Design a protein around this ligand. Structure first.
Ligand SMILES: C[C@H](C[C@@H](C[C@H](C[C@@H](C[C@@H](CCN1CCCC1=O)N1CCCC1=O)N1CCCC1=O)N1CCCC1=O)N1CCCC1=O)N1CCCC1=O
Ligand SMILES: O=C1NCCc2cccc(c2)OC/C=C/COc2cccc(c2)-c2nc1c(O)c(=O)[nH]2
Ligand SMILES: [Mn+2]
Ligand SMILES: [Mn+2]
Length: 178
């Protein structure tokens, strides 16, 4: 499906297997839903870079775990720190700022995606951080959590994936897909 071969050669093999394992958990096959396959791989890579931008063990990685296991660590964090349980599964937990982080990668307007995720999670205690393929970012209360250098690499990698999709003529089908 062309997009499938590009995903396997663009993303780290463990990230590709994680997106496959996550898609098959929700009854989706990455061989047909190739645009969703590239989006989950991109979201998985950004989340792993985000947690890497911290300090040693600043973040608790929620994304990439099984649906049952991810909710298990979420319950453990809520029952040890005391934060409110979120209605939807977040991506990380900031042990420094004591809040869950929700990371999104957009292809449309970066200003729009926040409006979608803000009106979804009623628990306003959890943070929200959107990255864009054009190099923009938007976080809750202007608290961008990470250092400027850590976020700049995520934007750079996001634009690199954009150029590779357009170079093989799949960016338009992937951008006009969410
Ligand atoms: C812990 C383990 C897997 C981790 C996933 C994540 C991958 C990490 C790998 C590092 C090294 N880098 C960086 C350079 C290339 C590379 O290889 N990064 C971060 C950047 C991209 C990447 O690949 N991390 C973080 C801790 C060590 C590790 O490997 N995950 C998966 C979800 C939860 C989690 O912590 N786990 C945990 C149990 C199941 C499993 O597989
Ligand atoms: O937490 C998340 N978990 C996604 C795990 C998953 C895998 C397959 C199917 C799913 C769930 O069913 C629910 C979603 C179905 C639409 O597939 C896409 C496509 C592109 C991005 C995302 C989801 C996306 N997933 C999350 C985010 O937090 C996020 O910001 N974006
Ligand atoms: Mn998630
Ligand atoms: Mn997310």
């Amino acid at each position: 499906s062309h997009m499938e071969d590009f995903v396997r050669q663009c993303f780290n093999p463990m990230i590709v297997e994680l997106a496959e394992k996550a898609m098959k958990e929700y009854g989706e096959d990455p061989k047909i839903e190739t645009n969703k396959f590239a989006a989950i791989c991109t979201h998985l890579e950004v989340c792993f870079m985000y947690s890497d931008g911290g300090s040693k063990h600043r973040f608790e990685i929620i994304e990439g775990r099984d649906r049952i296991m991810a909710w298990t660590v979420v319950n453990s964090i809520c029952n040890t720190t005391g934060v409110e349980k979120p209605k939807f599964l977040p991506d990380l937990y900031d042990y420094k700022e004591n809040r869950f982080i929700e990371i999104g990668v957009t292809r449309r307007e970066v200003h729009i995606y926040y409006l979608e995720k803000a009106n979804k999670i009623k628990s306003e205690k959890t943070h929200i951080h959107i990255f864009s393929f054009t190099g923009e970012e938007m976080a809750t209360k202007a608290d961008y959590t990470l250092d400027e250098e850590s976020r700049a690499r995520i934007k750079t990698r996001l634009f690199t994936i954009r150029q590779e999709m357009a170079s093989r003529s799949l960016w338009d089908s992937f951008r006009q897909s969410e």
